[PDB]
Amino acid sequence: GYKDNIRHGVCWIYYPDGGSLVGEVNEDGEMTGEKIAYVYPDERTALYGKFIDGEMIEGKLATLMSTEEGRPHFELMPGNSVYHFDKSTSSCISTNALLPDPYESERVYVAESLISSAGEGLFSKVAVGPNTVMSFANGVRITHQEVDSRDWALNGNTLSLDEETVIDVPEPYNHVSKYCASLGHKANHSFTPNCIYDMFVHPRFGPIKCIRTLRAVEADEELTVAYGYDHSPGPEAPEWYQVELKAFQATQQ
Amino acid sequence: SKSKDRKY
Numbered sequence: 733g734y735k736d737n738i739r740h741g742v743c744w745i746y747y748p749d750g751g752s753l754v755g756e757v758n759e760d761g762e763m764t765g766e767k768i769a770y771v772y773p774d775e776r777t778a779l780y781g782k783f784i785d786g787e788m789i790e791g792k793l794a795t796l797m798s799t800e801e802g803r804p805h806f807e808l809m810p811g812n813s814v815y816h817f818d819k820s821t822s823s824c825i826s827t828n829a830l831l832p833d834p835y836e837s838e839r840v841y842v843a844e845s846l847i848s849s850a851g852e853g854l855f856s857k858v859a860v861g862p863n864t865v866m867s868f869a870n871g872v873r874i875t876h877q878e879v880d881s882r883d884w885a886l887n888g889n890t891l892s893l894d895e896e897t898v899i900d901v902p903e904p905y906n907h908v909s910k911y912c913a914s915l916g917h918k919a920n921h922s923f924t925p926n927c928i929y930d931m932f933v934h935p936r937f938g939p940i941k942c943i944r945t946l947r948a949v950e951a952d953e954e955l956t957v958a959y960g961y962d963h964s965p966g967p968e969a970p971e972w973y974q975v976e977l978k979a980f981q982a983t984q985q
Numbered sequence: 986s987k988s989k990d991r992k993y
């Protein structure tokens with residue numbers, strides 16, 4: 733049946749975040765087969781294998797080595813690292829809490845923050861340019877009502893996803909020894925940040941957010957983001973943030 | 986809201 737026509741070609745479908753699905757689609761235009769891949773935004777790191785309508789059933793870590801006539805040419809990495817679609821629930825953060833994301837692992841690490849009295853922070857492993865996705869913010873999915881109706885002490889890393897859902901990394905998963913599948917919850921706040929939270933559609937985590945650089949960042953530079961609490965609902969925010977906001981407003985004046 | 990990055 734092989735012929736030079738669309739039915740025998742390959743398709744790439746991009747998310748606005750720059751990740752993509754690639755492969756030969758079936759008769760209904762679906763990303764279904766044994767040789768489908770998700771390609772991360774570096775256009776190099778890939779999860780290649782069995783997908784059904786774009787959902788990763790068994791993706792093996794690979795490197796996109798070249799494209800020929802639009803067709804991706806992958807090399808599988810050693811180790812038998814496999815991944816699957818595993819969107820969190822209200823009560824389960826991951827079925828592999830200790831299995832790191834391979835793209836994130838090459839780009840960030842956790843260490844003591846340079847910000848005083850601020851615990852751990854997130855650092856770049858290597859020099860990167862502007863607009864680079866560095867890290868993923870995954871967590872359990874709970875309601876705004878639950879979050880808004882409980883103490884700030886429990887809301888240290890709650891991250892709004894949309895009007896219906898908040899992502900949380902509750903104790904003890906805020907410790908790397910118990911959860912390290914994603915690390916975006918380790919980035920500290922700055923009113924002068926070098927990164928932003930941005931939407932991301934992840935093949936393992938599903939629809940989440942990521943940390944993306946605004947500008948070039950050096951190796952070993954701390955990654956910071958604006959937490960974006962409501963300043964005028966004074967602010968509804970932790971005391972440390974309220975103090976820093978006053979200091980920030982003072983510098984602007 | 987007691988969470989980061991909500992659109993207000």
Ligand SMILES: Nc1ncnc2c1ncn2[C@@H]1O[C@H](CSCC[C@H](N)C(=O)O)[C@@H](O)[C@H]1O
Pocket residue numbers: 845847848849850851852853887888889906917918919920921922972976
């Ligand atoms: N600018 C800042 N000043 C002080 N503390 C900060 C801060 N940004 C973040 N934090 C701290 O980081 C928490 C959010 S989660 C960020 C990672 C955290 N530092 C950790 O060690 O796991 C806050 O509850 C607060 O303890």
